[PDB]
């Protein structure tokens, strides 16, 4: 449960439909990671790193409800 280091070195860059996102996780920068990280869980159960600096990602978060 506890973040001990950055989990995302690279992010998935190909925009896709938010309907494939079953779980959204926004992790603010802290003592163990200097940047904000976004991890998404897909329908298949696969976890994916997304770039919080990309507009399409900002929109999926802003319109997630």
């Amino acid at each position, epitope marked *: 449960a506890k973040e001990l280091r*950055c989990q995302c*070195i*690279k992010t*998935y860059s190909k925009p896709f439909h938010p309907k494939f996102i079953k779980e959204l996780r926004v992790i603010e920068s802290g003592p*163990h990671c200097a*940047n904000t990280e976004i991890i998404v869980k897909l329908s298949d159960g696969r976890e994916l790193c997304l770039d919080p600096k990309e507009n399409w990602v900002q929109r999926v978060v802003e319109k997630f409800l």
Partner: antibody
Amino acid sequence: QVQLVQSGAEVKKPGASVKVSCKASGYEFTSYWIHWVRQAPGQGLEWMGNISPNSGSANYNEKFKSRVTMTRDTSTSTVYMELSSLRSEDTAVYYCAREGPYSYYPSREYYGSDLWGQGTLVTVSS
Amino acid sequence: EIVLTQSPATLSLSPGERATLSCRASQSISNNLHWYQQKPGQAPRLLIYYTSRSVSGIPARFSGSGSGTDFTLTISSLEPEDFAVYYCGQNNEWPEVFGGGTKVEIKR
């Protein structure tokens, strides 16, 4: 030729600053973290921090966070470590090291640091 | 703070003998414990990663094992090129922490 090539030996006075470089070649620059680890004469290994070559987002050891800066130049696949307010205790061989490969799939199983630069001796003396 | 304790500080062994090096972690680091070899005037070199996983180019005589916070590097039969300093390093959390090193020296 997979390599990490560091800049030459440095001699600095206390209070001064040092900037060491690490040039990466022969691999996908963005797939590996670049760590800075120092070794004081006759001592063990100490982690300074690291940087993601893609984002340039650097993580520091709380011990040096007030005086260390890590940057990268994707154009030249070069990583830099700037250490300021130098003291005698900073006299060490500074190594850069890569850890990866990683992708956009997060994991809880890590690789070790499989490739290390030749090291840079930094001497801090009056 | 994670503290990695390596024992013994020095192992004096004859070539051909088995070298067993121990690393104890102050708290759990999962299996994110790696082993490095360092020779005088050279950079450390990765031997074993993720407790027991094999590294490309490293001889088969090197093996790692781990039970909780207790880790072991075994060199099945010491060859002349194996007499060096060995460090365990964890990266389960940052800051990364290295043990104090174990020197493997030639007993004669």
